[PDB]
Coordinates of N, CA and C and ligand atoms in Angstrom, one line a residue:
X1 N 5.1 2.1 13.0 CA 6.5 2.5 13.0 C 6.9 2.6 11.5
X2 N 8.1 2.2 11.1 CA 8.6 2.0 9.8 C 10.0 2.7 9.7
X3 N 10.8 2.3 8.7 CA 11.9 3.0 8.1 C 11.7 2.8 6.6
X4 N 11.7 3.9 5.9 CA 11.6 4.0 4.4 C 12.6 3.1 3.8
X5 N 13.8 3.1 4.4 CA 14.9 2.2 3.9 C 14.5 0.8 3.6
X6 N 13.8 0.2 4.6 CA 13.3 -1.2 4.5 C 12.1 -1.1 3.6
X7 N 11.1 -0.3 4.0 CA 9.8 -0.3 3.3 C 9.9 -0.3 1.8
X8 N 10.7 0.6 1.2 CA 10.8 0.7 -0.2 C 11.5 -0.6 -0.8
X9 N 12.5 -1.1 -0.1 CA 13.2 -2.3 -0.5 C 12.2 -3.4 -0.8
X10 N 11.2 -3.6 0.1 CA 10.1 -4.5 -0.2 C 9.3 -4.1 -1.4
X11 N 8.9 -2.8 -1.4 CA 8.0 -2.3 -2.4 C 8.5 -2.7 -3.8
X12 N 9.8 -2.4 -4.0 CA 10.5 -2.6 -5.3 C 10.2 -4.0 -5.9
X13 N 10.2 -5.0 -5.0 CA 10.1 -6.4 -5.4 C 8.7 -6.9 -5.3
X14 N 7.9 -6.3 -4.4 CA 6.7 -6.9 -3.9 C 5.5 -6.2 -4.5
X15 N 5.4 -4.9 -4.4 CA 4.3 -4.0 -4.6 C 4.4 -3.4 -6.0
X16 N 5.6 -3.0 -6.4 CA 5.8 -2.2 -7.6 C 5.3 -3.0 -8.9
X17 N 5.3 -4.3 -8.8 CA 4.9 -5.2 -9.9 C 3.4 -4.8 -10.3
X18 N 2.6 -4.3 -9.4 CA 1.3 -3.7 -9.7 C 1.5 -2.2 -9.6
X19 N 1.9 -1.7 -8.4 CA 1.7 -0.2 -8.1 C 2.9 0.7 -8.4
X20 N 3.9 0.3 -9.3 CA 5.0 1.1 -9.6 C 4.7 2.6 -9.8
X21 N 5.4 3.4 -9.0 CA 5.3 4.8 -9.0 C 3.9 5.3 -8.6
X22 N 3.2 4.6 -7.7 CA 1.8 4.9 -7.3 C 0.9 4.6 -8.5
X23 N 1.0 3.4 -9.1 CA 0.2 3.0 -10.2 C -0.7 1.8 -9.9
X24 N -0.9 0.9 -10.9 CA -1.6 -0.3 -10.7 C -1.3 -1.1 -12.0
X25 N -1.7 -2.4 -12.0 CA -1.6 -3.2 -13.2 C -3.1 -3.7 -13.5
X26 N -3.7 -4.3 -12.5 CA -5.0 -4.9 -12.6 C -6.1 -3.8 -12.8
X27 N -6.1 -2.8 -11.9 CA -7.1 -1.7 -12.0 C -6.4 -0.4 -12.2
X28 N -6.2 0.0 -13.5 CA -5.4 1.2 -13.8 C -6.1 2.5 -13.4
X29 N -6.5 2.7 -12.2 CA -7.2 3.9 -11.6 C -6.9 3.9 -10.1
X30 N -7.1 2.8 -9.4 CA -6.7 2.5 -8.1 C -5.2 2.6 -7.9
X31 N -4.6 3.8 -7.6 CA -3.2 4.0 -7.5 C -2.7 3.6 -6.1
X32 N -1.9 4.5 -5.4 CA -1.7 4.6 -4.0 C -1.6 6.0 -3.5
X33 N -2.3 7.0 -4.1 CA -2.5 8.3 -3.6 C -3.9 8.5 -3.0
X34 N -4.0 9.6 -2.2 CA -5.2 9.8 -1.3 C -6.5 9.7 -2.1
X35 N -6.6 10.3 -3.3 CA -7.8 10.2 -4.1 C -8.3 8.8 -4.4
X36 N -7.3 7.8 -4.4 CA -7.7 6.4 -4.5 C -8.0 5.9 -3.1
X37 N -7.0 5.9 -2.2 CA -7.1 5.3 -0.9 C -8.4 5.7 -0.2
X38 N -8.6 7.0 -0.1 CA -9.8 7.6 0.6 C -11.1 6.8 0.2
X39 N -11.3 6.4 -1.0 CA -12.5 5.7 -1.4 C -12.3 4.2 -1.6
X40 N -11.2 3.8 -2.3 CA -11.0 2.4 -2.7 C -10.5 1.6 -1.6
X41 N -9.8 2.2 -0.6 CA -9.4 1.4 0.6 C -10.6 1.5 1.6
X42 N -11.3 0.3 1.7 CA -12.4 0.2 2.7 C -11.8 0.4 4.1
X43 N -12.3 1.5 4.7 CA -11.7 2.0 6.0 C -11.3 3.5 5.8
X44 N -10.9 3.9 4.6 CA -10.6 5.3 4.3 C -9.1 5.6 4.6
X45 N -8.6 6.8 4.3 CA -7.2 7.1 4.4 C -6.7 7.1 5.8
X46 N -6.2 5.9 6.2 CA -5.6 5.8 7.5 C -4.5 4.7 7.5
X47 N -3.5 4.9 8.3 CA -2.4 3.9 8.4 C -2.9 2.6 8.9
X48 N -3.8 2.7 10.0 CA -4.3 1.5 10.6 C -5.1 0.7 9.6
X49 N -5.9 1.4 8.7 CA -6.6 0.7 7.7 C -5.6 0.0 6.7
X50 N -4.6 0.7 6.2 CA -3.6 0.2 5.3 C -2.9 -1.0 5.9
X51 N -2.5 -0.9 7.2 CA -2.0 -2.1 8.0 C -3.0 -3.2 7.9
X52 N -4.3 -2.9 8.4 CA -5.3 -3.9 8.5 C -6.0 -4.3 7.1
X53 N -5.4 -3.9 6.0 CA -5.9 -4.2 4.6 C -4.8 -4.9 3.9
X54 N -3.6 -4.4 3.9 CA -2.4 -5.0 3.3 C -2.4 -6.5 3.7
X55 N -2.5 -6.8 5.0 CA -2.6 -8.1 5.5 C -3.8 -8.9 5.0
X56 N -5.0 -8.3 4.9 CA -6.2 -9.0 4.7 C -6.4 -9.3 3.2
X57 N -6.0 -8.3 2.3 CA -6.0 -8.5 0.9 C -7.3 -8.2 0.3
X58 N -7.6 -6.9 0.0 CA -8.9 -6.4 -0.5 C -9.0 -6.6 -2.0
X59 N -10.0 -7.4 -2.5 CA -10.3 -7.5 -3.9 C -9.2 -8.2 -4.6
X60 N -8.9 -7.7 -5.8 CA -7.9 -8.3 -6.7 C -6.5 -8.0 -6.2
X61 N -6.2 -8.3 -5.0 CA -4.9 -7.9 -4.3 C -4.5 -9.1 -3.4
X62 N -3.3 -9.6 -3.6 CA -2.7 -10.6 -2.7 C -2.8 -10.2 -1.3
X63 N -3.1 -11.1 -0.4 CA -3.1 -10.9 1.1 C -1.6 -11.0 1.5
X64 N -1.1 -10.1 2.4 CA 0.3 -10.1 2.8 C 0.5 -10.6 4.2
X65 N -0.5 -11.1 4.9 CA -0.4 -11.5 6.3 C 0.7 -12.5 6.6
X66 N 1.1 -13.2 5.6 CA 2.1 -14.3 5.7 C 3.3 -14.0 4.8
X67 N 3.5 -12.7 4.3 CA 4.6 -12.4 3.5 C 5.5 -11.2 4.0
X68 N 5.0 -10.5 5.0 CA 5.3 -9.0 5.1 C 5.6 -8.6 6.5
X69 N 5.4 -9.5 7.5 CA 5.8 -9.4 8.9 C 5.3 -8.1 9.7
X70 N 5.4 -8.1 11.0 CA 5.1 -6.9 11.8 C 6.0 -5.7 11.4
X71 N 7.1 -6.0 10.8 CA 8.0 -4.9 10.3 C 7.5 -4.4 9.0
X72 N 7.6 -5.1 7.9 CA 7.4 -4.6 6.6 C 5.9 -4.2 6.4
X73 N 4.9 -4.9 7.1 CA 3.5 -4.4 7.2 C 3.5 -2.9 7.5
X74 N 4.4 -2.5 8.5 CA 4.5 -1.1 8.9 C 5.3 -0.4 7.8
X75 N 6.5 -0.9 7.5 CA 7.4 -0.3 6.5 C 6.8 0.2 5.2
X76 N 6.2 -0.8 4.5 CA 5.8 -0.4 3.1 C 4.5 0.4 3.1
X77 N 3.7 0.2 4.2 CA 2.5 1.0 4.4 C 2.9 2.5 4.6
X78 N 3.9 2.7 5.5 CA 4.4 4.0 5.9 C 4.9 4.7 4.6
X79 N 5.8 3.9 3.9 CA 6.3 4.4 2.6 C 5.2 4.9 1.7
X80 N 4.3 4.1 1.3 CA 3.2 4.5 0.3 C 2.4 5.6 0.9
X81 N 2.1 5.6 2.2 CA 1.3 6.6 2.8 C 2.0 8.0 2.7
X82 N 3.4 8.0 3.0 CA 4.1 9.3 2.8 C 4.0 9.8 1.4
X83 N 4.3 8.9 0.4 CA 4.2 9.3 -1.0 C 2.8 9.9 -1.3
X84 N 1.8 9.1 -0.9 CA 0.4 9.5 -1.1 C 0.2 10.9 -0.5
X85 N 0.4 11.1 0.8 CA 0.1 12.3 1.5 C 0.9 13.5 0.8
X86 N 2.2 13.3 0.7 CA 3.1 14.3 0.2 C 2.8 14.8 -1.2
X87 N 2.4 13.8 -2.1 CA 2.4 14.0 -3.6 C 3.8 13.6 -4.1
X88 N 4.7 13.0 -3.3 CA 6.0 12.5 -3.7 C 6.0 11.3 -4.7
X89 N 4.9 10.8 -5.1 CA 4.8 9.8 -6.1 C 5.4 10.3 -7.4
Ligands
HEC1 C1 -1.2 -6.8 -8.2 C2 -1.0 -8.3 -8.2 C3 -1.1 -6.1 -6.8 C4 -0.1 -6.2 -5.9 C5 1.2 -7.0 -6.1 C6 -0.3 -5.3 -4.8 N1 -1.5 -4.7 -5.0 FE1 -2.4 -3.2 -3.9 N2 -4.1 -3.3 -5.0 C7 -4.2 -4.0 -6.2 C8 -5.6 -3.8 -6.7 C9 -6.1 -4.3 -8.0 C10 -6.2 -3.0 -5.8 C11 -7.7 -2.7 -5.8 C12 -8.6 -3.9 -5.6 C13 -10.1 -3.6 -5.8 O1 -10.9 -4.1 -5.0 O2 -10.4 -2.9 -6.7 C14 -5.3 -2.6 -4.8 C15 -5.5 -1.7 -3.7 C16 -4.5 -1.3 -2.8 C17 -4.7 -0.3 -1.8 C18 -6.0 0.4 -1.5 C19 -6.3 1.6 -2.4 C20 -6.7 1.2 -3.8 O3 -5.8 1.4 -4.7 O4 -7.8 0.6 -4.0 C21 -3.5 -0.1 -1.2 C22 -3.2 0.8 0.0 C23 -2.6 -1.1 -1.7 N3 -3.2 -1.7 -2.7 C24 -1.2 -1.2 -1.3 C25 -0.4 -2.2 -1.8 C26 1.0 -2.5 -1.3 C27 1.7 -1.7 -0.2 C28 1.4 -3.6 -1.9 C29 2.7 -4.4 -1.6 C30 2.8 -5.0 -0.2 C31 0.4 -4.0 -2.9 N4 -0.6 -3.1 -2.8 C32 0.6 -5.0 -3.8 C33 -3.3 -4.9 -6.8 C34 -2.1 -5.2 -6.2

């Protein structure tokens, strides 16, 4: 599901610290656009993957399974996925 209203509100405080504007801090190449996600998200460019990765915490990335609820797990994923797909980053 998701509503961008909520999803971005989380992003701003939670994700942006690394991925501000579809960026990174730790790995300045792994963004959140499709050219990154397609290869660097184990599972490839899918919402279900992003859901099932955001919670699990791939590599040098905090696991969100206990921070981000069945709501914002959907919320922020949907947000970044839209940006990614659209080129709206
Ligand atoms: C810095 C402490 C991070 C925070 C905060 C978040 N992410 Fe991240 N993410 C980070 C890194 C270094 C990586 C790559 C790890 C590796 O093994 O090299 C990622 C990866 C992602 C991906 C997959 C695509 C990619 O860039 O490799 C996605 C879809 C992603 N991250 C989403 C995401 C969201 C929505 C966050 C807030 C809930 C978030 N990340 C925080 C580092 C960091």
